Design a protein around this nucleic acid. Structure first.
Ligand SMILES: [Zn+2]
Ligand SMILES: [Zn+2]
Ligand SMILES: [Zn+2]
Ligand SMILES: [Zn+2]
Lengths: 198, 197, 197, 198
DNA sequence: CGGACATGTCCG
DNA sequence: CGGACATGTCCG
DNA sequence: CGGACATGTCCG
DNA sequence: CGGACATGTCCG
């Protein structure tokens, strides 16, 4: 078992929030967000765009971490990792280690880290200020197993914790949302929102 | 070990316990007998205990659970998991493997071994009731059957729930009997049938 | 891999298979469909296959079981356990953990990986039927569901049972389809209902 | 897992057989044998007298081993040993290690052995010729857990294998019987014999 | 075992 | 925010 | 979940 | 070869 990171929202000196796109609940959707649930319902290995929203610009050098943990406290001390099967299916892009649940899509400066003590996985990319014509940076994350994967997540819910750091692994912003990698992100969102009444 | 009191003490905040009304189907996960004031539940399944209070108590208020043997011949013995279950590495990473009572769903859960009495207990910060709820629910697990050989060994037990401040002082006390067993509903029915002449 | 034949060959000894007639209750451990010639059984539960013979065959006669994929698109792929189950260390100490088919109850059980085809199979010495029995029973286990991801992956399979001498030569061949699944009875019923127009 | 010893009957140069006493099926019995089943139904830690029957006398020096194995082939490779609880209940007679299922009662020259490779337990006592007025030696064995012990035998059936050896651990005779340590050796015997018709 | 559904897949 | 099924799971 | 019972304990 | 119950388990 391994110790657990904070999930608490720390907006920080620079006003760190998160943005997700209007997506609907078409049983089929690649990726959809529940503002009510604070949870992404996305599909296996399909692009999950995350909006890095800010008040004011971080020091050049700043890195951006992602790390999944189990949500329930009875699994929080267990490392989130890929099922034996996907771990072995040769789906590496030549960057991401085959065991890592979270990948960053389309960026050469991506680092994948296995924590020295806790043994937890994460992926970091350098910060890069918003667009020419846009008020936030967007990262492209992929989830590499379904939440249901046998011998992996095993139908147990996770959080993604996105952290803003300087280049020493020191905190500057923190935010977090629930995640479900599933077949029909559309149908499951409705069913879980619809369950909120109770 | 010196036996902590169990004398129900509703207190300043009119604190009583509530439980789910879940019927007596054989293999119901958890079921409570009002007639017996006794929960019948399954090994390591979820056992909701409701906290009912009259007036919301102060901040930094804590909620404690401890088992004691109910018979007075066994009252001073520390209630513990059996040696089989203590060694089956079924810890969640948060509970000590010897502790019979667990709380799930709470990251602020704290486990205690008394330096004086050696008695296991488990505490969580008290929280005011949810959006429109009338009470706060706490989900406990019992990690050995009442029948565990070398553990409880068929001896009934009580769960003593204490409302306390940040300091350690009693604000409130309640208790109920527990049976942890394979068929909570079957057993509730038998023991209630056996009230009748 | 070169696909072994499955062409039923009753042989000199009038060897056919029999199976228990166990009904279609949802969670029946093992059940056989005559209409489908298909066993529906649960992961690692006991699956009696009866050997019926006309005239008792010679000594040192052996009995082999092997899985192949039934669809011809998948026929050459070696049937294997999935990566999860291969690594759950559920071996009995006698079976290799990658082998889907096991025999229980037999100390003379032998497991084989072909040096040519790489295909797993399992063999036991043939024994004449018991005290007044009409057949010899062999108890097999299937150690992955048909649905195992990275294993069978929802692809139906056949079990090829071969009667052979001490040497390796075919004396007898039969086969049936297997589904390993959580509800053998439910699934038998659905698939048979689906025969009808 | 550990390799499995032979159980096959080897009567040997000296005609090695076993004898058990007429005992009946009084639901209560300390110890009773089923000739039909070749199986002892006895109770936890109660005296199980085993008859060492012979044709002709073994070389002074000869030892007598007992070792339990599981009966079913799916457990035969697992070492038979005591449940965590009895293992810990301080019931040692100052000779038998707390982990050993089988003890020899009333004999000072008893050795308890943990096998060097397989890790299996056994207890050996020197051979001693029959009585002044008796045609066989009788050993007093005790079973130290019920077959049902949680984390021990776990309701799984065992064999006892009694071997005759010289003093180098070399074979001279072998015999074996099924065992059940239980609460009511009486009732269970009937029920298992009664099941033989089926 | 049912009921109810959790959750993947393919259908038209 | 598709529908219909394929196939595992949990609770009573 | 029932049915049926496996298997320990105490009863009169 | 006692009887009656206390309490876990497996199969359908
Ligand atoms: Zn996976
Ligand atoms: Zn226990
Ligand atoms: Zn599998
Ligand atoms: Zn024991």
């Amino acid at each position: 078992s391994s110790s657990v990171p904070s999930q608490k929202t720390y907006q920080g000196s620079y006003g760190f929030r998160l943005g997700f796109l209007h997506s609907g609940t078409a049983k089929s959707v690649t990726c959809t967000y529940s503002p009510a649930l604070n949870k992404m319902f996305c599909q296996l290995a399909k692009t999950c765009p995350v909006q890095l929203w800010v008040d004011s610009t971080p020091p050049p050098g700043t890195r951006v971490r992602a790390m999944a943990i189990y949500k329930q406290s009875q699994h929080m001390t267990e490392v989130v990792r890929r099922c034996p099967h996907h771990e072995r299916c040769s789906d590496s892009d030549g960057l991401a280690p085959p065991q890592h649940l979270i990948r960053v899509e389309g960026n050469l400066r991506v680092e994948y880290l296995d924590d020295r003590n806790t043994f937890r996985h994460s992926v970091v990319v350098p910060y890069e200020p918003p667009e020419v014509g846009s008020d936030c940076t967007t990262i492209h994350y992929n989830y590499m197993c379904n939440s249901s994967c046998m011998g992996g997540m095993n139908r147990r819910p996770i959080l993604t914790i996105i952290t803003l750091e300087d280049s020493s692994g020191n905190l500057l912003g923190r935010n977090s949302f629930e995640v479900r990698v599933c077949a029909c992100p559309g149908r499951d969102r409705r069913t879980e929102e619809e369950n909120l009444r109770k």
